[PDB]
Paper text:
Whereas previous studies on salivary gland extracts from the sandfly Lutzomyia longipalpis identified SALO (salivary anticomplement from L. longipalpis) as a potent inhibitor of the classical complement pathway (CP), its precise mechanism of action has remained elusive. We found that SALO inhibits the CP by binding specifically to the zymogen form of C1r.
Thereafter, we crystallized eSALO-WT bound to zC1r-12SP, collected X-ray diffraction data extending to 3.3 Å limiting resolution, and solved the structure by molecular replacement. The asymmetric unit of the crystal contained two copies of the eSALO-WT–zCr-12SP complex, which superimposed well upon each other (RMSD = 0.34 Å across 444 equivalent Cα positions); thus, our subsequent analyses focused on the eSALO-WT–zC1r-12SP complex represented by chains A and C. Whereas the eSALO-WT–zC1r-12SP interaction buried ∼1100 Å2 of surface area at the interface, the most extensive interactions between the two proteins were centered upon the zymogen activation loop of zC1r-12SP. Consistent with this, EBI-PISA identified 13 likely hydrogen bonds and four candidate salt bridges between the residues lining this channel, including N33 and Y/X51 (explained further in the following subsection), and residues from the zymogen activation loop of zC1r-12SP, which is composed roughly of residues V458-Q468 inclusive. At the periphery of the eSALO-WT channel, the side chain of E58 formed a salt bridge with the side chain of R461 from zC1r-12SP. Finally, outside the concave channel, residues on the first α helix of eSALO-WT, including D32, appeared to contact a secondary site on zC1r-12SP, which is composed of residues H642–Q647 inclusive. During the course of model building and refinement, we noticed a strong, positive feature in the Fo–Fc electron density map distal to the hydroxyl group of eSALO-WT residue Y51. Based on the geometry of this electron density, we suspected that Y51 had undergone post-translational sulfation during eSALO-WT expression and secretion from HEK293(T) cells. In the final model, this sulfate group formed three different hydrogen bonds ranging from 2.6 to 3.2 Å in length with groups derived from R463 and I464, which are the two residues linked by the scissile bond in the C1r zymogen.
Author numbering:
A (entry chain C): 308 to 416, 421 to 600, 604 to 703
B (entry chain A): 24 to 112
The structure:
Amino acid sequence: KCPQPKTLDEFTIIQNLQPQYQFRDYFIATCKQGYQLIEGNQVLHSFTAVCQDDGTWHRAMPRCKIKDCGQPRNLPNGDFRYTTTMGVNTYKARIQYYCHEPYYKMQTRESEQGVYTCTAQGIWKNEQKGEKIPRCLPVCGKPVNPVEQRQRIIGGQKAKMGNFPWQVFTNIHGRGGGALLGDRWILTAAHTLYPKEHEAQSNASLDVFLGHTNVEELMKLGNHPIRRVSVHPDYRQDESYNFEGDIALLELENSVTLGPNLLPICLPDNDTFYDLGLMGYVSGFGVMEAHDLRFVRLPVANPQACENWLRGKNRMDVFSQNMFCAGHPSLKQDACQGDAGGVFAVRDPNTDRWVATGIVSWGIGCSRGYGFYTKVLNYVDWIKKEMEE
Amino acid sequence: EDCENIFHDNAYLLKLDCEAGRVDPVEYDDISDEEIYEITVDVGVSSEDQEKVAKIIRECIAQVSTQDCTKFSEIYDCYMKKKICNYYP
């Protein structure tokens, strides 16, 4: 007649408490939901105790403490706030995930996707997809320090920090440019990595820099390694006259951390950006290395007048529908103001989101005239296909 | 030489923006002394030449009274008569 088992805490429940316990009799002790068997400092999956003839149970009853879900999982480019008590990750504890605005935004489906609670199973879970944490997607356009639209005659072309947080600098075969897409992809021109006239053996080196406006600070910030190159098959190096398909994507080995000086740019959707008269900003680190970044505002013109000028200047010409010209002959500055293989940034006043409409492609005539770019809107599908790989 | 070209190009771009109905010509005639100072220091003029540049700016905005798309074309002309680019590097 060993004594009746007595629960130490309140959550310990003895399964089928017999009125009396004799020799070779046993009792099993479980715990309520959200609580776990302990017994000392360790943890037990099950507890049973029996009588050793001398009225003594062979083992003492456990304690049944609360379950601890542990430290919440780290949200990439985000964090969490203790909705309940801080430091208490035990049962019935709620946290609120949040993303690093404005550079990142949480994926949607509102006080329902960022809230995660500690369940009785011992893990942080949410009502929709409990095991996995949310994901903070990068915000494409919306630069945090946009260029002033109140343009004046006295206007220095030197760009300030945060104006074009997507500009990149490449020193592959020469000084070239591009734009940042996401936190891992770089959109650039194809002829920047494949020489037109040189060709033949490639003095491979690459090197990609981004994050600042001064060249020396760009170099100091660090060299970003590339892991995959995707060139459009329409581009051909031997055809020095042609520049069709002058577009390429580079994949960084490690994703960058978006900040106020480093933000990507959205891709076009409707064609209203290529309408005549649209003012697009083209940035570049100047030629004849020149230090800081310099921008220039150019208007997109009628392709027919550009073709007339082309064939009137006894040029072979390689214009197509996937291209659009910009600038005006009355502009006394050189047609190479689209320095490097950068982008033709146009701001959409309907959504106030900057979008890359063209890529600096070919400009045969480093003196005066029009500039030529490649319509990004036509190659959007190929860009997305290469990105989803 | 490059200063005159940059100013002429900015004037032509403002003329195009006026022809598109996005920048009203009368709104352009307003600018505070703080804005003039910040522009002069961002372009890189001497701290002493800022007074001459401000005088030139005020006088040139004054002399041009035609409220049309050619205003930006005429103001530029005035900036060349007062030789403002000599206060720039």
